[PDB]
Specification:
Blueprint: E1 3-5, E2 11-13, E3 18-20, E4 28-32, E5 41-45, E6 59-61, E7 69-71, E8 83-85, E9 92-93
Antiparallel strand pairs: 1-4, 2-3, 4-5, 5-6, 7-8, 8-9
PDB class: nuclear protein
Keywords: Proteasome, PH domain, nuclear protein
Assembly: monomeric
Amino acid sequence: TVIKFRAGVCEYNEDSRLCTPIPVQGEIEIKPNEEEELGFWDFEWRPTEKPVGRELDPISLILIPGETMWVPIKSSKSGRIFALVFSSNERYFFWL
């Protein structure tokens, strides 16, 4: 049952090395893992909403409280960007 929801991603700037929220809203897709093996609510994102001059694409997101660390706030001035980082390079940032 790949359900669908509405959230946002997080673009990064190499000139300042920062992770701000993307102006595009797009949407996510709740998924019960590829075959309900890890019970991981795979969240598939995709440009299916109203963008703002920034063309994006589908981004497979994962949710594991026992593997990827949950980062709702990165100290300093920050609204609410839920970012999950594992250890190698599977670290994505999201904002609602």
